[PDB]
Amino acid sequence: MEPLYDKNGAVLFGEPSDTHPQSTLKLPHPRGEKEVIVGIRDLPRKGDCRTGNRLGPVSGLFVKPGPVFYQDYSGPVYHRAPLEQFKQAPMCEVTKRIGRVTGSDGNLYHMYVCTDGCILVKTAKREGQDVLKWVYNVLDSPIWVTSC
Ligand SMILES: [Cl-]
């Protein structure tokens, strides 16, 4: 299974892997002041990093299926999309572009939220027509999508 990581960046099982240099997740980075759930209409801004915002502290953007979005999160997270829990799908009608995530295969993906609430990834580069949806979350943990 793709490892989870604790708020200090340490792997909780398995082997650590690096994130893709072009990901919107830039490590090392702090997080986990508070768990702060946000709506899709109130995703945090890069300028909210030092100050927080009116919703609370901010370490970036985190997402899991539901969809559920967070601007900070203290528990275990993915640093890479756990592709074993994704399934091939056609491109959806996208409502929002949320970041660039490393997959558990090491590759870079663009990540989107669909009109149907599904989280979808599409390969950024190389092989054509790769597109997957996040259909299982057996550890009920979010991906750290962006760091501020
Ligand atoms: Cl997994």
Residue numbers in the entry: 21 to 168
Manuscript excerpt for this entry:
Npro is a key effector protein of pestiviruses such as bovine viral diarrhea virus and abolishes host cell antiviral defense mechanisms. The nonstructural protein Npro (N-terminal protease) is the very first protein to be synthesized, releasing itself from the nascent polypeptide chain via a single, autoproteolytic cleavage event (Wiskerchen et al., 1991). Detached Npro is proteolytically inactive but acts as a viral immediate effector to modulate the host cell’s antiviral defenses (Ruggli et al., 2003).
This tag was autoproteolytically removed following in vitro folding from inclusion bodies (IBs), resulting in autoprocessed Δ(2–21)Npro. A product-like conformation resulting from cleavage further delineates Npro’s proteolytic reaction mechanism, revealing three distinct structural elements in catalysis. Consistent with its proposed role as nucleophile in catalysis, we found the first catalytic element Cys69 to be located close to the scissile peptide bond on a distorted α helix. Intriguingly, Cys69 was locked in a disulfide with the P1-residue Cys168, reflecting a ∼3 Å displacement of the Sγ from the position where it could attack the scissile peptide bond. We determined 1.25 Å and 1.5 Å crystal structures for solubly expressed and in-vitro-folded Npro, respectively. In neither case could we observe zinc binding at the TRASH motif but disulfide bridging between Cys112 and Cys134.
